[PDB]
Enzyme design. Structure first.
Site, PDB file in Angstrom:
ATOM      1  N   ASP A  54       0.825  -1.213   0.000  1.00 14.47           N
ATOM      2  CA  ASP A  54       0.000   0.000   0.000  1.00 14.47           C
ATOM      3  C   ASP A  54       0.873   1.284   0.000  1.00 14.47           C
ATOM      4  OD1 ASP A  54      -2.532  -1.727   0.837  1.00 14.47           O
ATOM      5  OD2 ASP A  54      -3.292   0.321   0.788  1.00 14.47           O
TER       6      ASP A  54
ATOM      7  N   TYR B  91       1.910   5.457   0.610  1.00 12.16           N
ATOM      8  CA  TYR B  91       1.911   6.317   1.818  1.00 12.16           C
ATOM      9  C   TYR B  91       0.681   7.198   2.064  1.00 12.16           C
ATOM     10  CZ  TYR B  91       6.834   5.019   2.354  1.00 12.16           C
ATOM     11  OH  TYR B  91       8.014   4.312   2.456  1.00 12.16           O
TER      12      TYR B  91
ATOM     13  N   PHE C 145       8.179   2.937  -1.847  1.00  8.26           N
ATOM     14  CA  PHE C 145       9.171   3.398  -0.885  1.00  8.26           C
ATOM     15  C   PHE C 145       9.542   4.838  -1.135  1.00  8.26           C
ATOM     16  CE2 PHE C 145       9.510  -1.090  -1.560  1.00  8.26           C
ATOM     17  CZ  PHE C 145       9.355  -1.545  -0.237  1.00  8.26           C
TER      18      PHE C 145
ATOM     19  N   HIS D  27      10.900  -7.898   5.436  1.00 12.53           N
ATOM     20  CA  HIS D  27      10.546  -6.511   5.160  1.00 12.53           C
ATOM     21  C   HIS D  27      11.298  -5.442   5.899  1.00 12.53           C
ATOM     22  CE1 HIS D  27       7.624  -3.083   4.453  1.00 12.53           C
ATOM     23  NE2 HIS D  27       7.707  -3.639   3.262  1.00 12.53           N
TER      24      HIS D  27
END
Length: 228
Positions: A64, A66, A77, A187
């Site tokens: 998902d 930000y 990212f 992660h």
């Protein structure tokens, strides 16, 4: 270049798909109602904007986007400049510093320079609702991003996918291990990190593979100013 195919040919047929459309008809209604949706629309398809089909080298998936202000802008990212460096990235930065020599923390979560190298920063779901984490899942994006993958996997040979997290590892199950290099790991997240990620050395092995097939390696040191 345009070096093989463009996203529009392998996506001529989907973007005009019933599901994809609701997916955008939906977001259309909300934004209309007044629900701040991130990220801005012009930025929605940025990854595809900067990393053509025929130019993928590496592939990093995000789930998902930000949900917080100023952060998101299309690439996984990647946060915008000014936008404080999200934990995830931080851990990447480090692991980078650690394994690649000479790397020293950028201080900007701006990762456009990577996509400009042929790295596709694809968040599985492309939009979300501010504050509401994972709020735009199962709206169909996954389905778009799912096809998107079989695309590279089938019309592209020798690709590097770095799989971080179980979700994304769920995603690349289709990817032919023989045709595309698939490195896995935990992660970058503060939680996941320590227990697999840090040490994975995905950034270097990535280039070992690219050099291998005679390709140009990736300068994981993100540049910021370009024009001004």
């Amino acid at each position: 270049m345009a070096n093989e195919l463009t996203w529009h040919d392998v996506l001529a047929e989907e973007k005009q798909q019933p599901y994809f459309l609701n997916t955008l008809q939906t977001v259309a209604s909300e934004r209309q109602s007044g629900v701040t949706i991130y990220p801005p629309q012009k930025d929605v398809f940025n990854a595809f904007r900067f990393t053509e089909l025929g130019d993928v080298k590496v592939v990093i998936l995000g789930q998902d986007p930000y949900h917080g202000p100023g952060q998101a802008h299309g690439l996984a990212f990647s946060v915008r400049p000014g936008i404080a460096i999200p934990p995830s990235l931080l851990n990447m930065y480090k692991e980078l510093e650690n394994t690649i020599p000479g790397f020293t923390r950028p201080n900007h979560g701006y990762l456009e320079s990577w996509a400009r190298q042929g790295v596709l920063l694809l968040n599985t779901v492309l939009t979300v609702r501010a504050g509401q984490a994972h709020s735009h899942a199962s709206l169909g994006w996954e389905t778009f991003t799912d096809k998107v993958i079989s695309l590279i996997n089938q019309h592209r040979e020798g690709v590097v996918f770095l799989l971080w997290g179980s979700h994304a590892q769920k995603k690349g199950a289709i990817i032919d291990k023989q045709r595309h290099h698939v490195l896995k790991a935990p992660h970058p997240s503060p939680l996941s990190a320590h227990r697999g990620f840090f040490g994975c050395n995905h950034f270097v092995l990535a280039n070992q593979w690219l050099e291998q097939r005679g390709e140009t390696p990736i300068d994981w040191m993100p540049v910021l100013p370009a024009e001004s």
